[PDB]
Amino acid sequence: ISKDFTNLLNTLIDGQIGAASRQTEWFNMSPDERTDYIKQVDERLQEMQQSTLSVLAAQHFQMQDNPVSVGDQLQTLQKRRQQMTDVPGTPAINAYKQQLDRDILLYRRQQTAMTHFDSTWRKVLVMLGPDDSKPLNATTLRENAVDKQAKLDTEIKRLEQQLTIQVADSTFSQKYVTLFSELQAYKDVNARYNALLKASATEEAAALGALTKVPQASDDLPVNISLLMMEERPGYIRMNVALVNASTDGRFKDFFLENGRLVVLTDGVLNFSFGTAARSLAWQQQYRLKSEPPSFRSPTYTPIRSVLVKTEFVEKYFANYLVSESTLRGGFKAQLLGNGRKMLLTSVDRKVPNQIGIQVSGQAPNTTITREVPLASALSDLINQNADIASFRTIGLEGFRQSSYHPDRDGLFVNIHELERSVGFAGRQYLLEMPQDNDYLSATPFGVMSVDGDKVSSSHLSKAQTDTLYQYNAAFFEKLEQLRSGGMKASRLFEGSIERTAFVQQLVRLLERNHITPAGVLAPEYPRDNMRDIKGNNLNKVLWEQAFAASVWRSRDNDPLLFRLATRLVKNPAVVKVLQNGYVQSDIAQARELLAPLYEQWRTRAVEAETQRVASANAAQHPSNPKVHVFDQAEVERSLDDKLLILLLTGPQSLEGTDVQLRPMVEAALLSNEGRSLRKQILFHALRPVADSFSKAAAPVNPHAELGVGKIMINNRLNQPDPYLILNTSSEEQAYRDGSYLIKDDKYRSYNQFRPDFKNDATRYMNDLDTPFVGGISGTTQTVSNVLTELFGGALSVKQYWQFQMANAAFMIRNGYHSFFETFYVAARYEPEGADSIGKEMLQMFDKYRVEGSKKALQGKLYDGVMARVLPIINQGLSAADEFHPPRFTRIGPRPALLGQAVKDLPRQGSADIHQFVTDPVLFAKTHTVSAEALVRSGRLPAEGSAQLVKVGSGLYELEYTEQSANDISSSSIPAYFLGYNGPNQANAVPAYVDIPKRTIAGNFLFTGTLSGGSLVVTSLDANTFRVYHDGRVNSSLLYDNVVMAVDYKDYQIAGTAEGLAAAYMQYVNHEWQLVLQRQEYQRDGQMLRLRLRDDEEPLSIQVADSQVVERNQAQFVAYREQIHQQLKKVATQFEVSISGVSDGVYTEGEFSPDHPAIAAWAKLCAEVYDRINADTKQLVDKRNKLYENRRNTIRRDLINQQIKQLNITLEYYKAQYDTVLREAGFVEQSWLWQQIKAKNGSAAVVRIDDTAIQGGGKQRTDSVGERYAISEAYQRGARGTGFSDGLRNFREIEIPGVDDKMSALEMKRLFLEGKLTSEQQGALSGRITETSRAEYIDKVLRQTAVFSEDFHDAGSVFDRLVPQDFYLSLVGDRSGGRAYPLVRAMTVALASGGEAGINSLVQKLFFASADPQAGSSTLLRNSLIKLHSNVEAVQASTELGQFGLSEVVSRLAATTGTSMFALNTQNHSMMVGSTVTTEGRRYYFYDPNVGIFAFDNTKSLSRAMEQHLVGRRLAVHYGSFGSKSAPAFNLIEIDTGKMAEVPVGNGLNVADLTRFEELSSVIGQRRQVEQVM
């Protein structure tokens, strides 16, 4: 809370960053992350105070010998409290008191219950016994039976009744405990009495014993009283059941709420448990009680499902099980449920009482044979009867979803959240400081951490050490507690104080000692390449290396080599040495589980050997010793593990004898994924001792000059074991005993023993490359790779070598033994000499990148540099469908691959609410937002198809077109008629239309793409059919004739704005079509966007067919045009522009045009009044750029950042106030022009039936075939009768004249744009085009994105950003080639207006929009790059210069002055090229949308790069450039960034607006927040 504490944290943060070397756990944060970090700092400091210093207080106190006794627990605790009621208040003290108090309450309750139980037992024995005239004996008890059994029953009934009434009591109470104890005593004594009556003469004495044996020793409780102590509220126990994982897909056992009922996901679960631990293991050891065995806590670690359940149910079946005392139980008990079902109870733990394996089973419902089967539904219903429906909960569920989100990764931890989720967790143990040694050291409350190069240990604290540690740490924490509240005034840590500096010097080492550092706790969603992991390695490189290791590990590709290796290797005697390794014994333990039936059969053999041991010991002559007359556990266990090892190395073919009968089972096991992974993870461990056993000397075959010739500088480690990462992984509780201990060697210890030696040259080299570091250059990999020719017994092919060597590198990364680099370096040093060897290059490439990394962030360039050289050697034999490809490195975290195995088989499902929508479409449309986006990003929708909804959010559904039949109603789909989307260009003469029956039978709905600046017009074509037109012009309803229904822009326009958005569709209802309009908007909702129904007006409105609609609109349009001319006259007067002579020129002649003389006065007036504000705002635009240039380059972001916000607010006022006016003036002018053209020349001049009568704004515009095709496949103009869909569905059977499979994609695109073929032929040719196109894009570009990065690098580039291969503007058609033409037009605005920061922001936007393809922003972006394919405003921003050879283009750039940009718009594709010259010299840029954007300092370098790229690798021929193969010719188009920036892309966004440093939800927020608010 205190500002002073916040300033202190900011001070040490900034200072600790400034002190950083490379490789540090601090890094610079976002100014939002800053706050999340500080929040977690404060929270975890409070956790320390309550949960470790408090327990230390409980040992500085209690040092004096109070009365202590294991029996007088209550009294011991009571006096420990009265010892300390005098102690001053302090959070560690308060937490200690409160813990001791709650334990006092529990022990008091238990002691009360046990007392009243015993008194009741004695009372009932007196009641059942004879009068004092006789001794208590079985005879008199038998004589009493007929009366006093009924008396016992009567009392039991009375007690049960009274207790059931008392269960209405709101909390545990003396009466409740009393009655419960009485009931248990009566029940148990009744049972024992009846057993005595049933006891035989031989049992009678034992049953009388069991009656006289009162549990008065109190050595264990009555079971039901233990359950009483487990009750969470009187009459209820908390049940829980623990998941393997949250089972969203059914892979795991689960128990979850579904429709208010609780539901077990599977028919029985081994993982139930009851109750909850009374205290943490820390307190458990502080009381020095027995801790609960770890087999309760070990088996799972993910969120847990729990509810309160009625104690009677628990005590009926499960008290038979739940006793902690060793009552005889087998593996199982089967319990008859009253419905005739079984419940099976399973001894899933042989020691712990309160965790249970449970199964319900019974006669299979509705079956021909009475087989009993398990029944999850029966268990669910029985629980729902016995459960409370209230206070079901899942423990930690939000914590999981806010830190892991899902089962995150197949590799080691990266931050403490992933550590704490991992299987190694048990409980968060903070360490604290023991500073009274000469230098500071780390201690637990129980012990100080002894550390050694080999070993880490604790010596338990003697009293003087506890007094030191407590008094010091408490003195520090008291200061911290003061600073949060009394501030600097209280704490006296004034800015000049030496005490302040000492204090900070202590806090910083506290925050390092515990990994509360930023790299420890932030765990972001998408990792900026700045961020660093818990060891200070670069975060993104670690994530990528983990995803690489996983992908290599999962492929089935290398297995024929590795298992050949294993089959040979197993014959060496040294392999036995592998088994006594400590780490191998982690995982062969899992093999004992996987092969359990065989392993059991083996052990049943092995236990025979004991009999031969004892026999041999007796056969020895006159044995003076039981020489081996013993069961040697270690002998059998060794022999068994050795057998399991051999059966894992050599295949199941090794099975022999009777076990061949089980061999089909073993074969089925070992080929599982879990089988293969274990079967090789034991192999690589087995490899090391064998390699060592040859002792062949080191002899690398490739020399390297930079790092010492002839040797390697292996290992390169400093041993500096981290104590926190050790103790926060499960050591044995022997550490917790308050006794000195040596900690286990878990596998992670290999991850935690080592730290880089900054003095060594190899470290200096690696720190120049800035690889991750883990344990240095792998001398192990040297020792292995030196002898491969002897392990395999012959030379490897470079293919076989690189296969083995990549699998080994994956094994090393997977187990956390080394980095990628730490292995591949020695591989490249050891790669065999040979015609295809590649290590020489790889070394030179490392050196080349070293001399860079000392200066620049390599951002993964190294990994691509390696994979470019390895992959074509690995994949050398394979088909393109079967090649291996690793995940691809990116600025965002590593994304999945796009080729080969990773895709092979590795649509949205839709929701049945479609039937509700069908049932009441009006109510549905009133209550849910129906969006249409997928009806925009599909072109060429059929005339007839299946329509379905998909749910996306709360009341939010999307339509999709689909091919699935409605006769699978599970498709959630119905017959409907679609209408294609028409384009946004106001020059369009050819609207989209389709014809549908009056009195339809075939289908009852019609859908269209989202309306944004267009009209839906319904007209009556004849007696029986409507023609429905989607026209892309505003106000189009005025232009057609015989209009019977229409929705124009004005009907859904937000008044006083350019903004509008609406879904429109048609429905056949009450025997007539109804035009249904659902007005929408985009709205901001917590740094995201969503659609919603518009709430400021009726979201739905409806027209039946009408006649007067034309007149009704026309009057409105005339008035509105007059009114907007008033608006513009006003504003122009406000800026002093002369309106004289501005009026409509009488339309005399000619086609539609912008800047036609008739409107020229209005257009000029707009253009000028716009200039009067555009020049004005530019003065702030420059200032804003100056600001962003200082924001990127300074520490104190939040100082100046708000100024950005205020300048934005200022500008957006001007936009909101005047852009709307100018836009509306343009629209009303284009509309009046088109109306004049109709009025003079008739509708046939203003609507055309098809586009084949080629004409436009000029007689030809020489648009590339690529562009004119993409336009022809992202808008519908003309109808699409079924023939086109039939051709598309049959396109592999159909044949087309003058086409063959070896035509280029270009020559097909051309012939398709000839339009001469039938619709069935055009459908087939379209399909053939898309198939050929993506086959070529795969073969030419995705498979070679690696080498281009390196060509641009060593041609000399000075900045680069790869762009996502994956971002597509349409899921259908040619995905590859359609995005190029809009993207270059956006990018050139970005670059001209914001330089390298613009390019960064835009590529970030593309990345997010490809990672989350269905988030609101990624939809809006896709819907806003479309509408740049043919927007005539973009043609206003163009000038098609001639063809040029590349050299001339370069010379032209050299000739340019000031910023200038050019597209190349090659015949089938569009690179971009251009220059900026403002400062930092002249930088020349090049951009290929299939690869990335690159920059250069000099035109010589630029041409040297661009030639290599376009001709050196022949891509100019794949892009179909003009003229000769050598010296290709390109068009070029001198884009005017002054005008291109301002083209409308719908929803009121200028392209600049999508092209900006903020997120779209920011800009839209600012608009709503300054327009509608204020």
Short mmCIF file of N, CA and C in Angstrom, two decimals, residues 423-474:
data_model
loop_
_atom_site.label_atom_id
_atom_site.label_comp_id
_atom_site.label_asym_id
_atom_site.label_seq_id
_atom_site.Cartn_x
_atom_site.Cartn_y
_atom_site.Cartn_z
N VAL A 423 5.18 -32.56 -10.83
CA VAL A 423 5.12 -33.74 -9.98
C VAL A 423 6.11 -33.67 -8.82
N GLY A 424 7.20 -32.94 -8.98
CA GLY A 424 8.15 -32.78 -7.89
C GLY A 424 7.66 -31.96 -6.72
N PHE A 425 6.49 -31.35 -6.81
CA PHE A 425 6.10 -30.44 -5.75
C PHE A 425 5.56 -31.21 -4.55
N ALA A 426 5.51 -30.52 -3.41
CA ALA A 426 4.95 -31.07 -2.18
C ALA A 426 4.42 -29.94 -1.31
N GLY A 427 5.22 -28.89 -1.16
CA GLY A 427 4.80 -27.71 -0.43
C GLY A 427 5.84 -26.62 -0.49
N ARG A 428 5.39 -25.38 -0.58
CA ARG A 428 6.27 -24.26 -0.84
C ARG A 428 7.05 -23.90 0.42
N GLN A 429 8.35 -24.17 0.41
CA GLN A 429 9.22 -23.93 1.55
C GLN A 429 10.13 -22.76 1.21
N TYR A 430 9.81 -21.59 1.77
CA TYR A 430 10.70 -20.45 1.68
C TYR A 430 11.92 -20.63 2.57
N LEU A 431 13.06 -20.15 2.10
CA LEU A 431 14.28 -20.11 2.89
C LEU A 431 14.50 -18.71 3.41
N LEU A 432 15.26 -18.61 4.50
CA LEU A 432 15.62 -17.33 5.08
C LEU A 432 17.07 -17.39 5.56
N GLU A 433 17.60 -16.22 5.91
CA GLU A 433 19.02 -15.93 5.89
C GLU A 433 19.64 -16.15 7.26
N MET A 434 20.86 -16.71 7.28
CA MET A 434 21.63 -16.94 8.51
C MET A 434 22.91 -16.12 8.49
N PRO A 435 22.81 -14.82 8.74
CA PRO A 435 23.88 -13.90 8.34
C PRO A 435 25.02 -13.76 9.32
N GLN A 436 24.99 -14.44 10.46
CA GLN A 436 26.01 -14.14 11.46
C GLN A 436 27.32 -14.87 11.16
N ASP A 437 27.33 -15.76 10.18
CA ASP A 437 28.61 -16.16 9.63
C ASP A 437 29.26 -14.98 8.88
N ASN A 438 30.55 -15.15 8.58
CA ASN A 438 31.31 -14.14 7.84
C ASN A 438 30.66 -13.76 6.52
N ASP A 439 29.96 -14.69 5.87
CA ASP A 439 29.16 -14.36 4.71
C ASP A 439 27.86 -15.14 4.72
N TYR A 440 26.85 -14.55 4.09
CA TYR A 440 25.48 -14.96 4.31
C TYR A 440 25.19 -16.34 3.75
N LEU A 441 24.30 -17.05 4.43
CA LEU A 441 24.03 -18.45 4.17
C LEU A 441 22.53 -18.68 4.35
N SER A 442 22.02 -19.75 3.76
CA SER A 442 20.59 -19.98 3.69
C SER A 442 20.18 -21.08 4.65
N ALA A 443 19.08 -20.86 5.37
CA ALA A 443 18.61 -21.82 6.36
C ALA A 443 17.10 -21.98 6.29
N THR A 444 16.65 -23.19 6.58
CA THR A 444 15.29 -23.48 6.98
C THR A 444 15.11 -23.21 8.47
N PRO A 445 13.87 -23.13 8.95
CA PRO A 445 13.65 -23.07 10.40
C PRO A 445 14.28 -24.21 11.16
N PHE A 446 14.53 -25.34 10.51
CA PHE A 446 15.07 -26.51 11.18
C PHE A 446 16.57 -26.67 11.00
N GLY A 447 17.16 -26.01 10.01
CA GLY A 447 18.53 -26.31 9.67
C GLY A 447 19.17 -25.41 8.63
N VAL A 448 20.46 -25.22 8.76
CA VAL A 448 21.25 -24.40 7.86
C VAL A 448 21.80 -25.29 6.75
N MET A 449 21.83 -24.76 5.54
CA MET A 449 22.13 -25.56 4.36
C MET A 449 23.64 -25.71 4.19
N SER A 450 24.14 -26.90 4.51
CA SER A 450 25.51 -27.25 4.17
C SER A 450 25.59 -27.48 2.67
N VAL A 451 26.58 -26.88 2.03
CA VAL A 451 26.78 -27.04 0.60
C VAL A 451 28.21 -27.44 0.30
N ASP A 452 28.37 -28.29 -0.71
CA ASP A 452 29.66 -28.82 -1.11
C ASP A 452 29.59 -29.11 -2.60
N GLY A 453 30.76 -29.25 -3.22
CA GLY A 453 30.79 -29.49 -4.65
C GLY A 453 30.03 -30.75 -5.04
N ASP A 454 30.12 -31.79 -4.21
CA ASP A 454 29.37 -33.01 -4.46
C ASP A 454 28.01 -33.04 -3.78
N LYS A 455 27.84 -32.31 -2.69
CA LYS A 455 26.80 -32.66 -1.73
C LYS A 455 26.14 -31.40 -1.18
N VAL A 456 24.86 -31.54 -0.86
CA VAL A 456 24.10 -30.53 -0.15
C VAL A 456 23.40 -31.20 1.02
N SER A 457 23.48 -30.58 2.19
CA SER A 457 23.08 -31.21 3.44
C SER A 457 22.54 -30.12 4.34
N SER A 458 21.85 -30.52 5.40
CA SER A 458 21.60 -29.60 6.49
C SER A 458 22.06 -30.16 7.82
N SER A 459 22.66 -29.29 8.61
CA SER A 459 22.94 -29.52 10.02
C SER A 459 21.81 -28.88 10.81
N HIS A 460 21.17 -29.65 11.67
CA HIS A 460 20.04 -29.10 12.41
C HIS A 460 20.54 -28.08 13.43
N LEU A 461 19.72 -27.08 13.67
CA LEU A 461 20.12 -25.94 14.48
C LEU A 461 20.13 -26.28 15.95
N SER A 462 21.25 -26.00 16.62
CA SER A 462 21.23 -25.90 18.06
C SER A 462 20.69 -24.54 18.50
N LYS A 463 20.42 -24.44 19.80
CA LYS A 463 19.63 -23.34 20.35
C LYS A 463 20.24 -21.97 20.05
N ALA A 464 21.55 -21.83 20.20
CA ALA A 464 22.22 -20.57 19.89
C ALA A 464 22.02 -20.15 18.44
N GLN A 465 22.06 -21.11 17.52
CA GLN A 465 21.81 -20.79 16.12
C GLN A 465 20.37 -20.36 15.91
N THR A 466 19.43 -20.99 16.59
CA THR A 466 18.05 -20.54 16.50
C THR A 466 17.86 -19.14 17.07
N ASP A 467 18.52 -18.82 18.18
CA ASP A 467 18.38 -17.47 18.72
C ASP A 467 18.96 -16.43 17.78
N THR A 468 20.13 -16.71 17.21
CA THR A 468 20.70 -15.86 16.17
C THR A 468 19.72 -15.65 15.03
N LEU A 469 19.30 -16.75 14.42
CA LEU A 469 18.51 -16.69 13.20
C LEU A 469 17.20 -15.98 13.45
N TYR A 470 16.51 -16.32 14.54
CA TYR A 470 15.26 -15.66 14.85
C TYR A 470 15.48 -14.18 15.09
N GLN A 471 16.38 -13.82 15.99
CA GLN A 471 16.47 -12.42 16.37
C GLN A 471 16.85 -11.55 15.18
N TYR A 472 17.78 -12.02 14.35
CA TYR A 472 18.14 -11.28 13.15
C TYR A 472 16.97 -11.15 12.18
N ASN A 473 16.42 -12.28 11.74
CA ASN A 473 15.37 -12.23 10.73
C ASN A 473 14.16 -11.45 11.23
N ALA A 474 13.80 -11.62 12.49
CA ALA A 474 12.70 -10.87 13.06
C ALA A 474 12.99 -9.37 13.06
#
